[PDB]
Write an enzyme that holds these catalytic residues in place. Sequence first.
Site, PDB file in Angstrom:
ATOM      1  N   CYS B 209       0.841  -1.191   0.000  1.00 19.75           N
ATOM      2  CA  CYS B 209       0.000   0.000   0.000  1.00 19.75           C
ATOM      3  C   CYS B 209       0.879   1.245   0.000  1.00 19.75           C
ATOM      4  CB  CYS B 209      -0.911   0.011   1.230  1.00 19.75           C
ATOM      5  SG  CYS B 209      -1.980   1.468   1.362  1.00 19.75           S
ATOM      6  N   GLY B 210       0.293   2.386  -0.346  1.00 24.77           N
ATOM      7  CA  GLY B 210       1.036   3.638  -0.414  1.00 24.77           C
ATOM      8  C   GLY B 210       1.464   4.141   0.954  1.00 24.77           C
ATOM      9  N   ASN B 427      -4.454  11.113  -4.139  1.00 25.97           N
ATOM     10  CA  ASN B 427      -5.097  10.170  -3.238  1.00 25.97           C
ATOM     11  C   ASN B 427      -5.614  10.885  -1.994  1.00 25.97           C
ATOM     12  OD1 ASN B 427      -5.884   8.181  -1.484  1.00 25.97           O
ATOM     13  ND2 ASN B 427      -4.029   6.932  -1.707  1.00 25.97           N
ATOM     14  N   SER B 429      -6.632   9.918   1.013  1.00 25.65           N
ATOM     15  CA  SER B 429      -6.574   8.605   1.650  1.00 25.65           C
ATOM     16  C   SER B 429      -7.204   8.632   3.040  1.00 25.65           C
ATOM     17  CB  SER B 429      -5.128   8.123   1.753  1.00 25.65           C
ATOM     18  OG  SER B 429      -5.078   6.743   2.069  1.00 25.65           O
ATOM     19  N   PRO B 430      -8.013   7.609   3.355  1.00 29.10           N
ATOM     20  CA  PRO B 430      -8.490   7.339   4.710  1.00 29.10           C
ATOM     21  C   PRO B 430      -7.421   6.742   5.616  1.00 29.10           C
ATOM     22  CG  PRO B 430      -9.924   6.342   3.033  1.00 29.10           C
ATOM     23  CD  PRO B 430      -8.638   6.716   2.367  1.00 29.10           C
TER      24      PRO B 430
END
Lengths: 544, 541, 540
Positions: B209-210, B427, B429-430
Amino acid sequence: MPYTPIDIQKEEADFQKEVAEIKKWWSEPRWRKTKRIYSAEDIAKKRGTLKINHPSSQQADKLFKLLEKHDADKTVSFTFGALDPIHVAQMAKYLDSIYVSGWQCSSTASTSNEPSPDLADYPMDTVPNKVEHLWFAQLFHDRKQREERLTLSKEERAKTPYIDFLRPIIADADTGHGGITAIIKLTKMFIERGAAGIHIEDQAPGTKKCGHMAGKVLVPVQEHINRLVAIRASADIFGSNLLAVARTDSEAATLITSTIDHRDHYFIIGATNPEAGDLAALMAEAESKGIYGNELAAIESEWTKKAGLKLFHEAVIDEIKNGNYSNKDALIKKFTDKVNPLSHTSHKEAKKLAKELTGKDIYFNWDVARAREGYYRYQGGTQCAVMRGRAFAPYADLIWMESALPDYAQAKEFADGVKAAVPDQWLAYNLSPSFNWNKAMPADEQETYIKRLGKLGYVWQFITLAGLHTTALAVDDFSNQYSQIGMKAYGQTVQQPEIEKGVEVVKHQKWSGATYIDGLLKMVSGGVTSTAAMGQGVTEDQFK
Amino acid sequence: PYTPIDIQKEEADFQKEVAEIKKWWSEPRWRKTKRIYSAEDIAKKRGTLKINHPSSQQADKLFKLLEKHDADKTVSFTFGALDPIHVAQMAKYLDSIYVSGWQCSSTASTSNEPSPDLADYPMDTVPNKVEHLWFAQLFHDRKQREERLTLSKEERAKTPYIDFLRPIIADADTGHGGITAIIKLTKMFIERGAAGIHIEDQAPGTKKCGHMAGKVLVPVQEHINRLVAIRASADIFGSNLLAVARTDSEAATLITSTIDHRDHYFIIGATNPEAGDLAALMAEAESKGINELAAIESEWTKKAGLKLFHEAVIDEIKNGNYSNKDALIKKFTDKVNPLSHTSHKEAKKLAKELTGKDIYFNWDVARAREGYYRYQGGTQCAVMRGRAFAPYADLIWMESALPDYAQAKEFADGVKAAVPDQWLAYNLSPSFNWNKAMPADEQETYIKRLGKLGYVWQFITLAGLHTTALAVDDFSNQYSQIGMKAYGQTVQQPEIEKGVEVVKHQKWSGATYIDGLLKMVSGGVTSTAAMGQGVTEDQFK
Amino acid sequence: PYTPIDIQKEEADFQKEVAEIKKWWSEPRWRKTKRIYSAEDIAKKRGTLKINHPSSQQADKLFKLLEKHDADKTVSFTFGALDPIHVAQMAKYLDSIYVSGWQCSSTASTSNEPSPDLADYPMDTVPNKVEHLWFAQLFHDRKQREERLTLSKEERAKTPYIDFLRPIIADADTGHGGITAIIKLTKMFIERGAAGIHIEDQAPGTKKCGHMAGKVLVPVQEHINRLVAIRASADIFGSNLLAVARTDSEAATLITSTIDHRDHYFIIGATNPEAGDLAALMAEAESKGIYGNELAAIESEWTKKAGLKLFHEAVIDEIKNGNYSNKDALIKKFTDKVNPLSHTSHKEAKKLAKELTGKDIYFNWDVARAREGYYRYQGGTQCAVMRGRAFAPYADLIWMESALPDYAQAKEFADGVKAAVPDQWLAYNLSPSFNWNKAMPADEQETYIKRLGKLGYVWQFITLAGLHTTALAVDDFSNQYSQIGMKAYGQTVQQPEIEKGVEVVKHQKWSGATYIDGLLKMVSGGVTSTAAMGQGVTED
Ligand SMILES: [Mg+2]
Ligand SMILES: [Mg+2]
Ligand SMILES: [Mg+2]
């Protein structure tokens, strides 16, 4: 924000545009004999906003034209049941169409991986997936071969032979694997996954037999027509010239799910003896008292003899023959000329005539002869099959009657019978390995059998299980040798023969498309790459 | 035994196709798109039978949609859809759709075996997820068209229209292998309804993942080749498929090779000649059956004096016998910097000219046990790689550890300086805590603000996961506490009040559509109609 | 070249297995389970290699779970799960799990082609959906065990435990074909983690949702054979798989055959001798290109003229409007002998009517047939009881689809069934096809499940709840998202996730990252540079 706006005028305009496009489509020569019971309006309404063109449809066209020419030349497109990408790749050299078998799929290609005999009780997507298996192989090898050719000079091209890998596929849809909505969805898949044509049979689903198994249950003529309509509806919506093949199993079948359809009535067997009660319920009462086994089958065999089972016309003829009637031969003919296999005369109507001709209500009860599952008893043969052939013909680009033997006479009977009423109807014939072929025919006749049926108008013929059997022989034979004589078996039985017969696969790296992919690799890597698959070192310089 | 062919018509058709491709490539869509192969090269790869993948129309729709957004300096904002329900409801509000690899790992693997975001599900997993949604879109579009066209013109104009056919952009991870893999992966994406796919400069055996740690990068060129390979595939099978290039170089600390000159600036090495191979030192300590081990690393690292080579040059000059120091750094920094693409040999050569030392630098010794080289990216490294990818990529995307406006501007400005018309993607992102990272006033405008910088496509990667997760947990809790009241109260009443179409679920699912098909085939009428008298959706009128 | 075998050891192993099966069947689990074949019959069907499907353990867990519920007169209540997220969160609160065919049609077909609830997706669709959830359950169980066992005993006891492994009951629709189909379908369900499956007495490929119209039934015996076939499959491949029998006969109006005596009471026919075959009349009108609503006009005309009813209605009608003494007493002679539960065949009921009136009362159910050939059928709750009782021997749970959430009707059916089979577990659809705020007030809503629990409905499910919760949630957020950007996520989702303790908001941990880092380090000899949850991860 919360929704999207649209021009209501452009909507109608596009709708109308499409309706017209469909009407034009339907007016093409392809549909010259194709009955449709819905309007172009009906179909356009079913489509979405986004038109999709399935390449399978091009193979439908290719198949139709291919069959046109064969019909005109009174010659045959003959093929057999392909197992896998290897088969289609080698078949394409010799044959001009390709059969995907449900029988073979049951044993070798179910999507649950759980094999079976030919009962069409694999999951619905099984044969559609098998077509895509072959479809995509065809497309791949076509792609491979085009690169091989176009990296040669014009001088070199013309030396190297061309294979048409893209042979049209006709695939088993069994009985459609459920209702009308099922059949639409099944057809949709077949179109999406590369089917040129599919065939479909007038058996009940989930009693579905192979053609040369026993205990076959039929469905009402209309019910199977509706199936064919449903295929066409699907193909019309998603825009394929998909060919539809109608199969009837009524040559051999002995059961049927309903009496609802007047066309079937002639063939529905019933009891002539008023005293005979419900066989089904009689067996049930005997079973619940723990009579089983062969003593129970005694009670059936007794009831059947007592019940005097026959077809209603047999019963009318029997009354007249053994009766106080003056001019008997002439009185049967009054009945038989009006009431016969092809005559579509309902039972009420046939009783009414029998009353006029004899003055009896001749007794006939087909409810009592029912099987325990509820099926009605049924006596088809070739003439029944002709009846159903004719009925299906409007809805079906090919017509097909399963037969218990490879009998020329019977094939002629059925062809003549159908063409009498629909003379331009293409026919198809199962060249089944369920027949013993050296028992049924001498070899001189064998050689010409396809050709002869071609004359009668069987434009498409297939050996259903040939792929199974060629493979089965080959693997068993080699395995045997292999076990006896080690690697000599491979040199001798397979690889030398491969070289001598010119089989392309023995150079299997090239065949599999290695040089094709090396192309893609170099192209992406700016012309050159260190990891080339067919560079110096590959062990296919041992095949030059 | 074979089939004959007109050799002349062959060449003619070939040439015809080459020209068709050249014309295709000259369209305005490809205005910024670098291709390193010829139309000849591509035509040779195609077959005799042309195939038109409808996905390509959604590519066009996506490109035009993004064009207008770029021109208006506004954003196509979306999130990660789970299933047919999501896309059907999303289509009311949003204009594109994201299919997440992270979500697919947990919810949609084709082996049914879930995982964290490691792209170690089978290759066809996300392509299959797109088709999942694609086909739902197509179905609901088909359903809605029938509903409309069986109304009068008067009635149509009252009833609202949903555009179900929102273009899909899908996670290709790192491409799931080599170049041939990526072609085959792209082929599937095209066949299964992808408008665009995105792809990241991580190594495949190690894909994170990022916002996971321990991220390994690949050489700039290697990931370019990936993007080329996508394009090659799309060119062969004839899609205007959008390509998105992602870089994880903001945060990544490792890289598989030093082969690419552009990377050299960022490759960390040891300045101390005395430091030996860390990898082998650990191996020798482990084989004698040595947290006490991590002690030996932490000692070796301090002793080794790890840094980037320019840090080492600057350090030499600063603490050195040199007359004009500030001016001597600038000679080096102006020639050698993140964006300058200066190889290491070249940078050492200059350092020698400027100082008269072979300044010692060894990045072999700092290698991890797996063999990876150490790497210090940040936003400027990411700009370097952004610029490099831009020719090959319709959108550019830098993973970030926080939702930081400044950083996003730094990266946008940095990239657009060299490629000013490059579309960017962000992104949302959450993986960030969003109420910790900024106040709510800023939250509301954050997307818009990034839109100004040129982030034309933005997505919450995991929103579908989380909305569903909240909703199901909450209802399950209520359900367990107060029975069927929970459903009346928490779900079904709210569904009615908010106008949600699915509460009439027979209609929504397309029952009246299929009854259409049923009646049509049965000659107008049928006894087994699904929405006939008796259906219990007359309780929702 | 073949392989040799000891013929004596063969027989010995066969006999060994037969006995093992007999012992298996004698367990308390099968106390109510009728089998019509021998242990011999089953052993012969098995192979040389025994296979143990873990799904069977979840069958046991389900049976015991339901036993306790039946004893306590309380309910295992659940709903229809969509995906791994659902089962992972559900496991906190609920003790069983429903996989819906309806939901699978719209969201989970293996061809990816969605539909309404017609069970015309490919056969393996729901079996694949169970494995989807099964494997998620197994994975999260595996994740959680590692998390626990890398804590101290002190720390374990603080951190709560989730039972992810909730038994799954899955929709088998109508079995998706014949008997051989149903065996193969059951095999898949067992292999892919089904604790129990349910199956309905509708015809395949006319298959409706329970609250759609135009439902066609099959003969009682035919659906019994389906249930037997499930059991046969489970017996061969060795699962204690629970079987649920559903009847759609509350509302259904059609049936495929008249072959089964039990159905005859309910088969509708024409009392007017003058009415001819509706089917054939329609066919003649259709072939001349009358279609659509003008055709349905001809039906509505023929029906009125035909005087359709049940044969007993016809007998009562004859006596009522007839020259008979003691009429009330003469109906009761007939009704006491001939009624919904009485299993009286038609021949038998006509014979009695003749004895009681002296007429052959005219009744023709052939003429009322639909064009497809189906016979007309008037079920209600009593018909459903008739079929419930019939299925009960073969089915661990019994289930009657209803058009409303009516307590009275549910009691009628429960009482009706338990009168003849008092130990029969019942199941109830808590359907969102009902409007629930229209059908009852909220005070009753809260207690409705509990009340049905008393009547013996030990398993209850909201079939479509997963669909609807998700549908609401995504629509609502999408709306907010579109209006106020990232504020919507902070506000509508992520803050609520933190406050409600929802585990997934820490989604790296939830997804099993720290679990896999375990596997990574373990294989790499204790340490690795590419650790996924090392320093840098943004979950701090
Ligand atoms: Mg077959
Ligand atoms: Mg991802
Ligand atoms: Mg269902």
